[PDB]
Design a protein around this motif. Sequence first.
Motif, PDB file in Angstrom:
ATOM      1  N   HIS A  95       1.235  -1.279  -0.152  1.00 41.41           N
ATOM      2  CA  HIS A  95       0.306   0.053  -0.253  1.00 41.41           C
ATOM      3  C   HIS A  95       1.293   1.259   0.104  1.00 41.41           C
ATOM      4  CE1 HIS A  95      -4.268   1.333  -0.123  1.00 41.41           C
ATOM      5  NE2 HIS A  95      -4.459  -0.109  -0.156  1.00 41.41           N
ATOM      6  N   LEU A  96       0.976   1.227  -1.053  1.00 45.09           N
ATOM      7  CA  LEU A  96       2.587   1.999  -1.744  1.00 45.09           C
ATOM      8  C   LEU A  96       1.503   2.618  -3.182  1.00 45.09           C
ATOM      9  CD1 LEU A  96       6.155   1.465  -1.001  1.00 45.09           C
ATOM     10  CD2 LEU A  96       5.392   3.151  -0.816  1.00 45.09           C
ATOM     11  N   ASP A  97       2.621   2.238  -3.855  1.00 43.86           N
ATOM     12  CA  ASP A  97       1.767   2.186  -5.561  1.00 43.86           C
ATOM     13  C   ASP A  97       0.739   1.798  -5.833  1.00 43.86           C
ATOM     14  OD1 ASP A  97       3.598   4.543  -6.232  1.00 43.86           O
ATOM     15  OD2 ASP A  97       4.568   3.583  -7.819  1.00 43.86           O
ATOM     16  N   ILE A  98       0.402   1.060  -5.084  1.00 45.28           N
ATOM     17  CA  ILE A  98      -0.934   0.353  -5.738  1.00 45.28           C
ATOM     18  C   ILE A  98      -1.997   1.087  -5.835  1.00 45.28           C
ATOM     19  CG2 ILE A  98      -3.098  -1.848  -5.776  1.00 45.28           C
ATOM     20  CD1 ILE A  98      -1.134  -3.540  -6.524  1.00 45.28           C
ATOM     21  N   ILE A  99      -2.627   1.054  -4.868  1.00 51.02           N
ATOM     22  CA  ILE A  99      -3.537   2.640  -3.649  1.00 51.02           C
ATOM     23  C   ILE A  99      -3.066   2.869  -2.987  1.00 51.02           C
ATOM     24  CG2 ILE A  99      -5.131   2.997  -2.641  1.00 51.02           C
ATOM     25  CD1 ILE A  99      -7.155   0.674  -4.356  1.00 51.02           C
ATOM     26  N   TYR A 150       2.084  -0.235   6.543  1.00 47.73           N
ATOM     27  CA  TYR A 150       0.912  -0.547   6.486  1.00 47.73           C
ATOM     28  C   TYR A 150       0.594   0.380   6.827  1.00 47.73           C
ATOM     29  CZ  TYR A 150       3.247  -5.163   6.655  1.00 47.73           C
ATOM     30  OH  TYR A 150       3.842  -6.382   6.788  1.00 47.73           O
ATOM     31  N   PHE A 151       1.003   0.987   7.982  1.00 45.39           N
ATOM     32  CA  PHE A 151       0.571   2.388   8.654  1.00 45.39           C
ATOM     33  C   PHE A 151       0.925   3.255   7.710  1.00 45.39           C
ATOM     34  CE2 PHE A 151       2.520  -0.759  11.272  1.00 45.39           C
ATOM     35  CZ  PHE A 151       1.784  -1.743  11.111  1.00 45.39           C
ATOM     36  N   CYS A 152       2.442   3.604   8.603  1.00 45.37           N
ATOM     37  CA  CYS A 152       3.597   4.830   8.459  1.00 45.37           C
ATOM     38  C   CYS A 152       3.413   5.343   6.931  1.00 45.37           C
ATOM     39  CB  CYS A 152       3.999   5.754   9.172  1.00 45.37           C
ATOM     40  SG  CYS A 152       4.414   4.922  10.407  1.00 45.37           S
ATOM     41  N   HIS A 153       4.517   4.704   5.627  1.00 46.57           N
ATOM     42  CA  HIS A 153       4.358   4.999   4.453  1.00 46.57           C
ATOM     43  C   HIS A 153       3.393   4.776   3.258  1.00 46.57           C
ATOM     44  CE1 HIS A 153       7.269   7.205   2.035  1.00 46.57           C
ATOM     45  NE2 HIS A 153       8.337   7.199   3.183  1.00 46.57           N
ATOM     46  N   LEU A 154       2.167   5.620   3.941  1.00 45.11           N
ATOM     47  CA  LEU A 154       1.228   5.854   4.105  1.00 45.11           C
ATOM     48  C   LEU A 154       0.616   7.950   3.384  1.00 45.11           C
ATOM     49  CD1 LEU A 154      -1.456   3.811   5.555  1.00 45.11           C
ATOM     50  CD2 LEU A 154      -1.709   4.631   3.339  1.00 45.11           C
TER      51      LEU A 154
END
Lengths: 21, 21
Positions: free
Chosen positions: A16-20, B13-17
């Motif tokens: 959950h970086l480049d997908i969304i 899953y939290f932070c590099h968001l």
Amino acid sequence: CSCSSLMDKECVYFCHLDIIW
Amino acid sequence: CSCSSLMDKECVYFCHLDIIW
């Protein structure tokens, strides 16, 4: 990325970086 | 988020968001 079946001990720091985001 | 000192077993899953993505 490849994934660890529904996020677990190994799926986002990666996914959950480049997908969304 | 609070963090687990330099990403480890508990930081994204939290932070590099929303900080940076």
